[PDB]
Amino acid sequence: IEADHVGSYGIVVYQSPGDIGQYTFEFDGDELFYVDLDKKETIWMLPEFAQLRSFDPQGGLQNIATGKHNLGVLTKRSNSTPATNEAPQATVFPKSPVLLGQPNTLICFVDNIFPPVINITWLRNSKSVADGVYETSFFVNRDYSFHKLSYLTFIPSDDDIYDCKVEHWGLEEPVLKHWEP
Amino acid sequence: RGGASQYRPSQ
Amino acid sequence: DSVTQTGGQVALSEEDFLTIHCNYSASGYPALFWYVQYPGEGPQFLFRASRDKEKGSSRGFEATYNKEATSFHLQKASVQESDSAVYYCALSENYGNEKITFGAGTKLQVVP
Amino acid sequence: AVTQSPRNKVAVTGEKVTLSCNQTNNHNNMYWYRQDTGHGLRLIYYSYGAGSTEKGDIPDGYKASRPSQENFSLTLESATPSQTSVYFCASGDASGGNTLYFGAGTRLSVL
Amino acid sequence: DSERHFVVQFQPFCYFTNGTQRIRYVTRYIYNREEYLRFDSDVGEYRAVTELGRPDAEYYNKQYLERTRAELDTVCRYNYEETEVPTSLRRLEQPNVVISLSRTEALNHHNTLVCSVTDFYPAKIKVRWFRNGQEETVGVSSTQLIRNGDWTFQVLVMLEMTPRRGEVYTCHVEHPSLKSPITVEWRA
Helix, strand or coil: CCCCEEEEEEEEEEECCCCEEEEEEEECCEEEEEEECCCCEEEECCHHHHCCCCCCHHHHHHHHHHHHHHHHHHHHHCCCCCCCCCCCEEEEEECCCCCCCCCEEEEEEEEEECCCCCEEEEEECCEEECCCEEECCCEECCCCCEEEEEEEEECCCCCCCEEEEEECCCCCCCECCCECC | CCCCCCCCCCC | CEEEECCCEEEEECCCCEEECEEEECCCCCEEEEEEECCCCCCEEEEEECCCCCEEEECCEEEECECCCCECCEEECCCCHHHCEEEEEEEECCCCCCCEEECCCEEEEEEC | CEEEECCEEEECCCCCEEEEEEECCCCCEEEEEEEECCCEEEEEEEECCCCCCEECCCCCCCCEECCCCCEEEEEECCCCHHHCEEEEEEEECCCCCCCCEECCCEEEEEC | CCCCCCCEEEEEEEEECCCCCCEEEEEEEEECCEEEEEEECCCCCEEECCCCCCCHHHHHHHHHHHHHHHHHHHHHHHHHHHHHCCCHHHCCECCEEEEEECCCCCCCCCEEEEEEEEEEECCCCEEEEEECCCEECCCEEECCCEECCCCCEEEEEEEEECCCCCCEEEEEEECCCCCCCEEEEEEC
């Protein structure tokens, strides 16, 4: 389907077992916010946006609550057809042109995720990092799989290795995706 | 305040 | 949000024309309804209305969603002595809350 | 249907009071309202499902529990005169602006 | 078989064409990754997609039809005009524009000129190349617009060229966020 703009106002994802859930608002492919189900809070990707518009988490909670409900009426109706693991695909690219010493961000794109459960991490010189790293929620795809991005700020170095470790059930070994300046 | 689509229940 | 409605008590004769006012003050695009509280019971659903211009009806009672005057005025043909009850006007936002807000209610007494 | 208990509770200031509500509607949503003159119905608490406790509009002085699906209870820790009123319970299927089903109420007064 | 996972998905879509002058509302009920039921403001009702949604079909229509049809206005149209207009459809991020020569320079030698246009929003943009204020159309290519995921896009446009004495190539970028085009030169 085509149009100038698209808005998914309330994408629900309920995963059992684990009672794992996600609730987001998407507009033209980007992420507006997600409802942090634990804090019962609306998390906006863009700050200046929550200062002009808002959303009540309870709505998130109420619909997640329905996800739990339905994911059962179905898990049964489908005679329990368990879901099928897939293999995620990582791609690493910069945000801007890598100038030496000049600050920048490393972006790891991971498409074809299913189910939406996954560990993404960074590695500087085969050693890991856990800092200055941030990731998006699970964005939906036209084929009902998801994708997500992870970010690693850093400073361009003529002697630095990087990797995007991607762990997921449909992956026997944690896949790595190298990158160099 | 923006609204959201209701994920209807079933059965 | 608030649902402000017609005074407290009204009295009519049978066969008269019923009209109970209800105006609302909402932030989003809310669904509007009417419930009835017959003597000795708990309130109960009458009919809803989800969008401007939509009309809701039930048991001869009806009300039209008027986004322009933020009104949802209840109207009935000719009331019957058994119509005597408390009428509650209410709304629910489009946020999914599932939170139903109510008004003060209006006592209707149809004289025999 | 929906049923409440007790249907008449005379209590004393300070005392700890608890109302119980049951439903065979099988709805995942259940609410606790109170009816006062000039105020109509006002939401105190409600739940999205078992283990759910959402603060309504007038929560202060109250507490609730949804131990299962058919049961949602309200508890006044230290009852007070201002909490004298008719309490109504309700259940809803959680379908956007879910129509609400009400119990016959619990007339409670705090002397 | 504890490693037997499960999941359901609810995916709503509000398709906006020419403001709100035309909207199509789609509701997708998913199980794992199979779509079993769906609502289309164009079909006018709920319809079973697979065998799985054969049960819900009648119950969802009898119950939620009128409520779902309305969302085209209460959620879609409403949100667009109330929340989108002042945020999404107002965000304008000017892009950064640099020009790097692919290989080492060498007069009269086949080389490339890359123009990096990064961090912009929205996506609709236009980058042109010029050689001595005369537009280069041949030997101009580009990458697939990249969605950085942090509400910004980037793209690189190449210009195969031949560096000759006194030449001044120019990258021309036009964007909704620019009062006038950003122009960057590269001198031979």
